Design a protein around this nucleic acid. Structure first.
Ligand SMILES: [Mn+2]
Ligand SMILES: [Mn+2]
Ligand SMILES: [Mn+2]
Ligand SMILES: [Mn+2]
Lengths: 335, 334
DNA sequence: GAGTCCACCGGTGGACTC
DNA sequence: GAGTCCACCGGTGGACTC
């Protein structure tokens, strides 16, 4: 559970344990002795808790401490079972922490999407826990989907074929002269739910935890939407970075710039909203970096590439910021 | 020296050791116990060896073990001196192995400039080690400076003020909109040697090795050209990245784009040349990533990044840069 | 000395394929 | 299980300000 528990932990099967001893069955070409089982970790620590949608103690807790709990629980497990034999590299803890930050934050934005959708579809505004009721007038045509995008994803595969053919035509044009414009992905995309699904129920059900099924439910979600989204219906893009360094700033800025070149400049959509979430910005230089104008719009004919760098204090605040974003962004979508 | 020597290690002053025990002088907030003294490590390993300008064995040696040599020598020192206590985080090795890649590569490029420059200026073509006498026609006006740029640098600071005013006016434009266009820096720039220096001997001398004074010479070199470089006179920008990860590819792509927008777009420079050197592209496909078109081009066309180079040996890096200079300075009326 | 910033990258856990 | 790929980031050594 969120708070470590020796019993909860002995209840776990060997393959469900947050630490996976691989000393005697090793990743070839790696010294890795113990594996941080991040899915197992999300399961144990957040099996019953979606921060922002849980106890007041957790929703109001410093988000850094929320995101860090999985690794602390795993570290405890490892110490119980292996005592001073327990060694994980800091890069292990780095990788897992980054992935937890993204997944949990996505999960919180998922539940926000549920509650908002439920409201848009003329049901109630739920209220355990309580969040100031959104003011925008409901309509099922402005439900949103929260898509944590997978490793390797190409966000272009979200777009309706007609939009994809526009980009493909444009890139084939470049490829003849040995040039390109590859797209990768933000970590997460909030998109306007396709009509065809506006009556589907999964998009309105808040999950209770990041149990393996719900992890799957969440990380598979993008599949349901591939090929179905209009250019102007990609509402928000997010990059998660648990901490920043000056060198680790650029992937979102670059990708936001390309999203704009393509969605705005080639497909006539409105401002592409792309933001960066961090728990540890390490000075103020990132905030200045992200004041950069969108390059495409500059050199042609104007706003910033990255709308904001957000440092969520608590899960509740991330939930609040997103509702607020939806209330405000979804009034470009007609009821 | 390059090959580890217990002798040479014991004759080092305590402040010159490659490993610095900081267990009882612990760094504010860090559990680090021993530091990889990278400047000492370079003094030691490459004190008398600039790869590509040393023995043919080192020149033709696989660049990864060249660049890996200082860390290996440091671990040797730490284990001999602190036995079972010597522990160093992976991330320390990571950091130092990175700066070493960059510093040493910039030192190879420095010596190529020195030979190049010495040719341009009439003194003929040095010949140990052997490289292909560039074919282009010598001229003091086609000399170059190789500027390893320091952490925190703003490459605009290299431009002549007239060029810098154009940019600041452009950003005042934007600042009024709640906008900016911040510039950072490539890891290194090659600029046309300013006329006022084209007779200075220091730009024609090849360093024997990365002694500390030589490190400071190379790392300080940019101060001297600050404010003197015309936009078109930024010949090459290089980002060094010892290895790649798909997320670690974008700073130089982005900055290439910003440079291209500023220099080509607002200052009328030619195509700005910007490459990325790596020793380890595998597991990514950065080659595809770096085929991206310049976003300026597209708006108002060429690649942002001219190439991902993977130098197999220091000799090849020397060779490629001679090849490059020989071609790129057709543009300069010498 | 004490504190802050800068930019370095390699060891990761999981998706994917046989 | 063995191999590849993908995108995670935190622990660094040195320059800096005071
Ligand atoms: Mn994702
Ligand atoms: Mn991320
Ligand atoms: Mn540099
Ligand atoms: Mn670099």
């Amino acid at each position: 559970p969120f708070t470590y528990s020796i019993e909860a932990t002995r209840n776990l099967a060997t393959t469900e344990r947050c630490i996976q001893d691989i000393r005697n069955a090793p990743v070839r070409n790696r010294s890795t002795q113990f594996q941080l089982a991040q899915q197992n970790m999300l399961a144990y620590t957040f099996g019953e808790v979606i921060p922002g949608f849980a106890s007041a103690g957790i929703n109001g807790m410093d988000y850094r401490d929320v995101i860090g709990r999985p690794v602390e629980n795993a570290v405890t497990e490892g110490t119980h079972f292996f005592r001073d034999d327990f060694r994980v590299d800091s890069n292990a803890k780095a990788k897992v922490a980054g992935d937890i930050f993204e997944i949990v934050s996505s999960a919180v934005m998922w539940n926000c999407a549920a509650r908002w959708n439920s409201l848009m579809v003329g049901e109630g505004w739920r209220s355990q826990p309580r969040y100031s009721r959104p003011t925008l007038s409901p309509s099922p045509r402005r439900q949103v989907a929260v898509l944590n995008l997978p490793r390797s994803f190409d966000w272009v595969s979200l777009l309706v074929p007609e939009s994809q053919e526009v980009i493909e035509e444009f890139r084939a044009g470049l490829r003849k002269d040995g040039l390109g414009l590859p797209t990768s992905t933000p970590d997460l995309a909030v998109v306007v739910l396709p009509e065809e699904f506006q009556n589907d129920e999964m998009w309105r059900e808040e999950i209770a935890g990041l149990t393996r099924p719900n992890q799957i439910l969440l990380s598979g979600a993008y599949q349901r939407l591939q090929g179905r989204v209009q250019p102007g219906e990609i509402s928000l893009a997010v990059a998660f970075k648990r901490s920043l360094r000056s060198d680790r700033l650029y992937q979102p800025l670059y990708e936001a710039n390309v999203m704009q070149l393509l969605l705005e400049g080639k497909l006539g959509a409105p401002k592409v909203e792309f933001e960066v979430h961090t728990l540890a910005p390490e000075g103020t230089n990132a905030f200045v970096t992200y004041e950069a104008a969108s390059l495409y719009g500059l050199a042609e004919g104007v706003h910033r590439a990255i709308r904001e760098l957000y440092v969520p204090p608590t899960a509740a605040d991330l939930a609040r910021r997103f509702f607020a974003f939806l209330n405000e962004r979804m009034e470009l979508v007609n009821g």
